[PDB]
Write an enzyme that holds these catalytic residues in place. Structure first.
Site, PDB file in Angstrom:
ATOM      1  N   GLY A  23       0.790  -1.217   0.000  1.00 21.20           N
ATOM      2  CA  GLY A  23       0.000   0.000   0.000  1.00 21.20           C
ATOM      3  C   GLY A  23       0.824   1.270   0.000  1.00 21.20           C
ATOM      4  O   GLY A  23       2.044   1.225   0.138  1.00 21.20           O
ATOM      5  N   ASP A 143      -2.071   9.169  16.161  1.00 17.75           N
ATOM      6  CA  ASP A 143      -2.517   8.931  14.796  1.00 17.75           C
ATOM      7  C   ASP A 143      -3.201   7.559  14.616  1.00 17.75           C
ATOM      8  O   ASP A 143      -3.007   6.878  13.603  1.00 17.75           O
ATOM      9  CB  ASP A 143      -1.325   9.075  13.796  1.00 17.75           C
ATOM     10  CG  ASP A 143      -1.790   9.238  12.317  1.00 17.75           C
ATOM     11  OD1 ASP A 143      -2.955   9.646  12.049  1.00 17.75           O
ATOM     12  OD2 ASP A 143      -0.981   8.922  11.408  1.00 17.75           O
TER      13      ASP A 143
END
Ligand SMILES: CC(C)Oc1cccc(-c2coc3ccc(-c4cnn(C)c4)nc23)c1
Length: 337
Positions: A23, A143
């Site tokens: 990815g 995050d």
């Protein structure tokens, strides 16, 4: 630049042969590689953009993972194992154990369908346990999101579901790990009030009131709702709109937080300065509704998940449930049989 060094067949550091891209993101790319010096073992290599902010973040991540992997060498608390790092044509590259797809990718590949509730319970328990271990060692992740939670193994079985007239995939093993420690911050380091791109962001962050461990709890609440619905409840890239969406789902913001923020642009008198009858305003009313109206069943296991989610989405970080408390919530009773 990167496209010239991340192709199938390229060899990194005289040992890692690129198989394929797993990815991409703003930071760069993750690729699967064959490790020719560890008997052909497959690994994941994160190739970081040659751009200052991402190089800095990569150096920070390396320090954090060294500390976490040595403190917990068997990955009892489910932080990803870093194997080594190196430089390749000016790009920082970090080598990790090879995992399966992210939880986001699984949802996407299954047609934006939700996970079923017994899997959600296990995944949530592991995520809370992992991030609590960070919180016990004076860290905040900052995050957390579904892209950053990955299945240890993402294999599935497949069947036609008559209830929805569509084919559907069922995970075999829901075990996960947490990744991406490039924004992770110690209690004793500087906390930038400014932070970058995300919609798992806590209200104390948006309003620049200071933040610490509780901002992770807020993020985990947003993740759990996504797993349950198959989609985000805050589909926006504008801060003011985001605050308008929060008000519709959770009610109005506490007065004392509105009074303390130096971000005065968002408010008139002490109310969110939001035109309900604009183009954007009518979209917020139509897409968002009070939290409990998102429930798909009234069954008690659903009510329990929603009680836990509501406590994670408490506005005031000083009142928000901690992860230590969340691990004792009744939603998790069924795992202790
Ligand atoms: C965009 C990214 C999540 O794409 C995929 C998509 C599918 C697999 C993986 C993947 C498989 O084993 C891994 C080990 C570490 C990491 C990693 C470390 N830091 N970050 C940001 C990811 N990622 C994987 C990543």
């Amino acid at each position: 630049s990167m496209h010239l060094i991340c192709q199938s067949g390229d060899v990194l550091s005289a040992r890692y042969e690129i198989v394929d891209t797993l990815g991409e993101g703003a930071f760069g790319k993750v690729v699967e590689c064959i490790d020719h010096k560890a008997g052909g073992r497959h690994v994941a290599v994160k190739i970081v953009k040659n751009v200052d902010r991402y190089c800095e973040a990569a150096r920070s991540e390396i320090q954090v993972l060294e500390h976490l992997n040595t403190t917990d060498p068997n990955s009892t608390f489910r932080c990803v194992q870093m194997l080594e790092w190196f430089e390749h044509h000016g790009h920082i590259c970090i080598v990790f154990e090879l995992l399966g797809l992210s939880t986001y990718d699984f949802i996407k590949e299954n047609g934006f369908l939700p996970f079923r509730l017994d899997h959600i319970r296990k995944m949530a328990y592991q995520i809370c346990k992992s991030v609590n271990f960070l919180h016990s060692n004076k860290l905040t992740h900052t995050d957390l999101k579904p892209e950053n939670i990955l299945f240890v193994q993402s294999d599935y079985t497949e069947a036609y579901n008559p209830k929805i007239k569509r084919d559907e995939r069922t995970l075999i093993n829901p075990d996960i790990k947490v990744v991406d420690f490039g924004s992770a911050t110690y209690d004793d380091e500087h906390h930038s009030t400014l932070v970058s791109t995300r919609h798992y962001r806590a209200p104390e962050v948006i309003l620049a009131l200071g933040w610490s461990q509780p901002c992770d709890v807020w993020s985990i609440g947003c993740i759990l709702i996504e797993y349950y619905l198959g989609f985000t409840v805050f589909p926006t890239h504008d801060s003011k709109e985001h605050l308008a969406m929060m008000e519709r789902i959770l009610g109005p913001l506490p007065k004392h937080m509105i009074q303390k923020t130096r971000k005065r642009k968002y408010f008139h008198h002490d109310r969110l300065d939001w035109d309900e009858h604009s183009s954007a305003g009518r979209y917020v009313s139509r897409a968002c509704k009070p939290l409990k109206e998102f429930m798909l069943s009234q069954d008690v296991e659903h009510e329990r998940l929603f009680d836990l989610i509501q406590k994670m989405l408490e506005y005031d970080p000083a009142k928000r449930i901690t992860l230590r408390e969340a691990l004792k919530h009744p939603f998790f009773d069924l795992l202790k049989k």
